[PDB]
Design an enzyme around this catalytic site. Structure first.
Site, short mmCIF file in Angstrom:
data_model
loop_
_atom_site.label_atom_id
_atom_site.label_comp_id
_atom_site.label_asym_id
_atom_site.label_seq_id
_atom_site.Cartn_x
_atom_site.Cartn_y
_atom_site.Cartn_z
CB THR A 1 -0.95 0.02 1.21
OG1 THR A 1 -1.75 -1.17 1.21
CG2 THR A 1 -1.88 1.23 1.15
CB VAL A 2 1.72 3.85 2.13
CG1 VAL A 2 1.43 3.43 3.57
CG2 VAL A 2 2.61 5.09 2.10
CG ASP B 1 -11.75 11.75 -2.06
OD1 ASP B 1 -12.81 12.01 -2.65
OD2 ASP B 1 -11.10 10.71 -2.32
CE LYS C 1 -1.87 4.34 -0.89
NZ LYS C 1 -2.37 3.37 -1.92
#
Ligand SMILES: CNS(=O)(=O)Nc1nccc(Cc2c(C)c3ccc(Oc4ncccc4F)cc3oc2=O)c1F
Ligand SMILES: CNS(=O)(=O)Nc1nccc(Cc2c(C)c3ccc(Oc4ncccc4F)cc3oc2=O)c1F
Lengths: 278, 262, 264, 275
Positions: free
Chosen positions: B15-16, B121, B28
């Site tokens: 993911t990260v 977001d 990322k």
């Protein structure tokens, strides 16, 4: 006989488990050779909140029944909450719904019998409600017992999980959607919605707000009278009453005729699942 | 902006991944075994937005990755998110630097609107407090330039707008949705607790906000605060989109209230 | 990124002292003849490529009316003021951190094939005294396979930071990685000592002839006895008169991280 | 008559960096030169204290001094305005410089150097025709000399200075004296004598100064004692160069002092002014 299987399993540690196949995974303990189910839950919360959650999670040890999924333990690792339970090889009924498309009516009768007995057991011993009755939360094995899982046992964990997954399908009663008084009638509504959903295989009528609006302002769908016998529509329309005042309680689900005639039938679930898999 | 695989070493996972490339960098990476072309066009849109952003209050884009799994290379922030500072560790902030955080992230969103970017977001997990003083805005995966049916919402339901939730319009996302999300960020910033904390049902929150019955409660704002600030808080959370103020007026109000301290 | 701004910035008065502006926060502004246009497009061309936390952040350009370049406004003072004007009592860990940040910025620039050619402590700003910012790319360039064909112009700056091969100008293009390495070595000298090189000399032509003939070098005996030995070796061999013997920047970062992790 | 000096007392008129100014209570025209220094404050206080030294520097061959002050981050030096301009501007305007004017300017610079030696024991160090000025009344003054070593140390960074008339022996750091100023005076007199460097990066000029001897003027264009004067001023050996007492008894200085030249009239004809 399952009680002594936990007795030969002592402490459980993350390093003693291995990857095999929130998120749910299966785990096994190599000398014992048994299969366990692991549930992984991610939360960004306080340390004291995590510890009172785990202190509320130990209660599942005294939750022992053939209608409730068994429990092993729960702990904290790598900023994650781990829930260990005993594994159903048959999976939840949602996956076999996608596998088969439709389910024979006597099987839904047996599922209804199991879930109402589980609701009676849960309301007698712990006086708590399930809050999350949907086909993904109900499990079957290769043997034939049908058990409930992932119920609302820890209010702090409910507060932590209050904002997470978006919601594509909703099976929640209207009276708690307004924010009014809710009770076991909410679980009865959810059970009725689940059984009609596995009866017809799809929702017979959109974004989640549209489903919420349709649920609050309109009566639920009903089955045709010319297909099935009137007693099953009587079952579902007693289970799909909007007002929980005259919505049927568990006692007249027990003395209801359909549950009695389904109990009278001898349905071997293990043989039919073995015919299904092969 | 092409970077080959052999120069970026993937050091630690938090993911990260915290990697090393000419300095500490945050990578990322989207570990997907079967990349659908929908994720391809999402990645192209993300990098196309990130190339247009060059500001001190925005998390700085440096490069991307193509082969193996798709990855995004940006600078490594030191510190923690505003969510982790505010609801996980509870650092006792003082008033002044809270209004400093407010004006800095308002400047960031004003620059995004000037460069014609909709973040879409805006929430607490997207606010990085870098060495405790400088704010950074990141994760532009759902950023879109205005110029069709909108995609389904996927973020948390707290920071969404009522017209986002009821989504009766083809494109309900606009400046004012970001304005209301910034207002909710201000709400959690001046109080320290999440809104609608007394409700523990997700669908109940969605329906009560969508029907307009629910609203944030300003009663937990301390009365030693200037009344211009609470008036601004009340104005930025207004339900109807046509009277929510724009970011330059917000910045003007913030600097006007900052100037009056003797 | 690119594109032109407008009259949103304000002009206060129609080498000065301040050129500060305001365009969504504090910004820094720089300033029709052809000779200005060559350098101006070179500045914008090199500044479109720079995205790094150690590099000054280019923001935009203006072509209408006077030529302008807008960039972020750093807080603090230049490194030259920090060493030779106010004399801030720096500790050694801060100096090594400054050295490794400047080395990291140079490593990024040379890996992306950029020569500024023009180091001094004037062009190094301490952003809140913590993070380095490298700027003023007026004399920056991009290397190419045809870069040796063009003949470079006079640097006309300050002779204390240029290389002997630069100040001789015998090759067509005396500039390379190692000239910037030598300039960074003079920067290391200024960090580790605190005074300008060739302090006993008060004539620039004396410096030009005495260094360009290879007859001079900065005095290594002025380094402190509590300086790291690897640091002294590093600043010693990056100021070598031989162009080839000067180590590359990956070696410099490796040596600096080794000496940082070596300290208990 | 001029008292203390402040920045607000000056009115900018024209540019000669140099701005021609005047002092409003007094009404006299001065020349104000600005230099940018990034130097510590107490050092600039010392720069003021020994720029007060020029109060006792008065002579008919040295530029008059009024005051110095610090303002707005810039050191401000103030001198007497003296309108005929430097020999570089006169060289650009007039093209050539005749030999009798060369004798007069040589007499002026040598008497200025002797005055500085006998009255202040300091030196000029920067002999080049940009630093010698000419007045409309015919007097030739000197300026821009090294009065205070801290100011040399402070200015020792930026010079522009594409060329250099610096002495060879001051390129490797040997002993220096007024002989270096005499040599640079020889280069200046030859430079203007012909109006060009009569033979290209700066390091090549220093190489050219150090390693091989200076050129000779042709004998057919100037009188022989002029070449004798310059070749005595262009000796590489510091000891063999003639000192000031030797040049004050040379044939060229006595014939130039014996000459009566309308230098003021010729410069006014060159600039074309009517007071
Ligand atoms: C939509 N209605 S709602 O808004 O009330 N939300 C909520 N509904 C219902 C429940 C909860 C939280 C919940 C969760 C999800 C949970 C999951 C697993 C679990 O492990 C086992 N469980 C049973 C048998 C064996 C086990 F290993 C315990 C859990 O305990 C929990 O408390 C909610 F947040
Ligand atoms: C390049 N050669 S070098 O390397 O030797 N450097 C140096 N050489 C020589 C001198 C210096 C410094 C200097 C300068 C330049 C200076 C300039 C003007 C001044 O005003 C007046 N002057 C005379 C009369 C009246 C005045 F108002 C005083 C000055 O006093 C000074 O001290 C140098 F730095």
């Amino acid at each position: 006989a399952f009680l002594t299987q936990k007795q030969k399993v002592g402490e459980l540690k993350d390093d003693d488990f291995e990857k095999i196949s929130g998120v749910v995974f299966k785990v096994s303990h190599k000398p014992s050779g048994l299969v366990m189910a692991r549930k992984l839950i991610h939360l960004e919360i306080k340390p004291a909140i995590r510890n009172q959650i785990i202190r509320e999670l130990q209660v599942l040890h005294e939750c022992n029944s053939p209608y409730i999924v068994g429990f092993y333990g729960a702990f904290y690792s790598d900023g994650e909450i781990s829930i260990c339970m005993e594994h159903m090889d048959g999976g939840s009924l949602d996956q076999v719904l996608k596998k088969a498309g439709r389910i024979p009516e006597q099987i839904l009768g047996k599922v209804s019998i199991a879930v109402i007995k589980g609701l009676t057991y849960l309301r007698e011993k712990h006086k708590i409600m399930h809050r999350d009755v949907k086909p993904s939360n109900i499990l079957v094995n290769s043997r034939g017992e049908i058990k409930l899982c992932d119920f609302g046992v820890s209010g702090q964990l409910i507060d932590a999980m209050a904002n997470a997954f978006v919601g594509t399908r909703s099976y929640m009663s209207p009276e708690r959607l307004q924010g009014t008084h809710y009770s076991v009638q909410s679980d009865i509504w959810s059970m009725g919605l689940s059984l009609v959903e596995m009866a017809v295989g799809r929702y017979p009528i959109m974004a989640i707000f549209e489903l919420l609006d349709y649920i609050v302002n309109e009566p639920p769908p009903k089955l045709p009278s010319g297909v099935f016998s009137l007693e099953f529509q009587d079952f579902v329309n007693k289970c799909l009453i909007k007002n929980p005042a005259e919505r049927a309680d568990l006692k007249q689900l027990m003395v209801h005729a359909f549950i009695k005639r389904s109990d009278a039938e001898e349905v071997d679930f293990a043989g039919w699942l073995c015919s299904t898999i092969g | 902006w092409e970077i080959e695989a052999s120069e970026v070493m993937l050091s630690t996972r938090i993911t990260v991944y915290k990697g090393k490339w000419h300095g500490d960098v945050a990578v990322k990476i989207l570990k997907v075994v079967d990349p659908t072309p929908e994720q391809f066009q999402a990645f192209r849109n993300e990098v196309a937005v990130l190339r247009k952003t060059r500001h001190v209050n925005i998390l700085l884009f440096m490069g991307y990755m193509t082969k193996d799994n798709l990855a995004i290379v940006t600078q490594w922030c030191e510190g923690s998110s505003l969510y982790k500072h505010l609801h996980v560790q509870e650092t006792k902030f003082q008033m002044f630097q809270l209004i400093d955080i407010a004006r800095q992230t308002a400047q960031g969103m004003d620059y995004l609107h000037a460069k014609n970017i909709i973040h879409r977001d805006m929430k607490s997990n997207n606010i990085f407090l870098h060495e405790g003083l400088t704010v950074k805005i990141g994760d532009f995966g759902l950023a879109t330039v205005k110029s069709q049916q909108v995609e389904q919402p996927t973020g948390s339901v707290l920071w969404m707008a009522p017209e986002v939730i009821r989504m009766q319009d083809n494109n309900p996302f606009s400046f004012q949705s970001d304005v209301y999300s910034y207002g909710i960020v201000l709400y959690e910033l001046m109080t320290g607790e999440l809104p609608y904390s007394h409700i523990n049902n997700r669908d109940q929150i969605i329906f009560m906000v969508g029907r307009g019955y629910a609203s944030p409660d300003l009663s937990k704002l301390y009365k030693n605060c200037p009344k211009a600030m609470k008036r601004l808080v009340a104005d930025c959370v207004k339900k109807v989109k046509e009277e929510r103020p724009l970011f330059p007026q917000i910045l003007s109000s913030i600097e006007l209230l900052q100037h009056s301290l003797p």
